């Protein structure tokens, strides 16, 4: 019992999409956060994925094509033009996703404001007093998660972000590690995205689903003699 | 800029107590952990004592736990270790450093030292 997949039978030899769904030879079929267009035909170049006016997952069998929606993008209309050809017509595939502005919840620690990211909290570590390490509080608490969390430092960051994390600070007398996000929140999918805005570099996250434990961590990020560090906490149940 | 002095050193004959004082200066003092680190002859580097930066919990390796006493007054930007039943073996150049959790725990500042004799 499947859902949230499409799929296409365009040959011989679950949302099934046929010739009948096209119009004037062209389907605008329009995907969404983490579903799976599915099409079986014989493409023309035995390639597809362009740029029309970003393909995350693209599996190419002999007489289909799996993709995979990806999670995050910021392009308006980002699109992919399978061209397909089955009995004596010529059909193509325009696919897109919904345009939906996805918050990160981080702080930006970058001045420059003509970013493509938005973030939730912020902190202009320009300003902050050299030789000093402020801090910039996240947090998040909702049943189920699907969240962007990241930072954009305009300097070294750390540790690798968010690959690596920096464990919570603690009450008494003991020192904090690093350690791999897979262990410390204690999940599979963990989608993760990089990006560069001249001099700033921006790497996040993604969260999908409720956390078995309630967590935190931490992020460093320096620049010249300014230091700040992000500290998260995502709750469970 | 960022400031630390040392100061209380000198030479103590075997078994006996001294107290030493850092002075702390540009900078948020209540907002850093501080810890005294001390240098052998042999020139290695050890870790003496360390205190948070509310001055709540504390530290100690083994070597010294019991023997010295580390503390910390705010309101004043100074840092205290008074150490007692020195042994021989304490005889070095004690630094009063910093580090904050905002840094990986990174020694970035570290003052000039003073000199411990334990001797008779």
């Known amino acids: 019992y499947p859902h949230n997949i499409l799929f296409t039978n365009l040959t011989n030899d679950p949302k099934t999409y046929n010739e009948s769904n096209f119009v004037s030879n062209v389907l605008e079929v329009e995907l969404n956060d983490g579903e799976l267009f599915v099409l079986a035909c014989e493409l023309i170049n035995k390639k597809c994925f362009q740029e029309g006016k970003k393909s995350n997952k693209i599996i190419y069998h002999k007489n289909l094509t799996i993709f995979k929606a990806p999670f995050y993008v910021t392009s308006k209309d980002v699109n992919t033009e399978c061209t397909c050809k089955f009995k004596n017509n010529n059909y193509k595939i325009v696919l897109k996703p919904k345009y939906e502005k996805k918050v990160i919840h981080g702080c930006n620690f970058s001045s420059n404001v003509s970013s493509k990211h938005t973030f939730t909290d912020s902190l202009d570590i320009s300003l902050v007093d050299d030789s000093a390490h402020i801090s910039c509080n996240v947090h998040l608490s909702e049943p189920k998660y699907n969240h962007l969390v990241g930072l954009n430092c305009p300097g070294d960051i750390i540790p690798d972000c968010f690959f690596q994390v920096y464990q919570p600070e603690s009450e008494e007398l003991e020192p904090s590690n690093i350690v791999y996000l897979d262990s410390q929140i204690n999940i599979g999918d963990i989608e993760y995205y990089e990006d560069a805005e001249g001099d700033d570099k921006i790497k996040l996250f993604g969260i999908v689903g409720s956390i078995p434990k309630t967590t935190s961590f931490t992020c460093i990020c320096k620049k010249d003699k300014k230091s700040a560090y992000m500290t998260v906490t995502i709750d469970s149940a | 800029d960022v400031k630390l002095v040392e100061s209380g050193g000198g030479l103590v004959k075997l078994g006996g107590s001294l107290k030493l004082s850092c002075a702390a200066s540009g900078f948020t003092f209540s907002s850093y952990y501080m810890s005294w680190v001390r240098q052998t002859p042999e020139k290695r580097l050890e870790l003496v004592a360390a205190?948070?930066?509310?001055?709540?919990?504390?530290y100690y390796p083994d070597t010294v736990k019991g023997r010295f006493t580390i503390s910390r007054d705010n309101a004043k930007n100074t840092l205290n270790l008074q150490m007692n039943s020195l042994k021989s073996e304490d005889t070095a150049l004690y630094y009063c450093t910093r580090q904050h959790y905002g840094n990986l725990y990174f020694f970035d500042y570290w003052g000039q030292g003073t000199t411990l004799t334990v001797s008779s």
């Open positions: 205190i948070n930066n509310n001055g709540g919990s504390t």
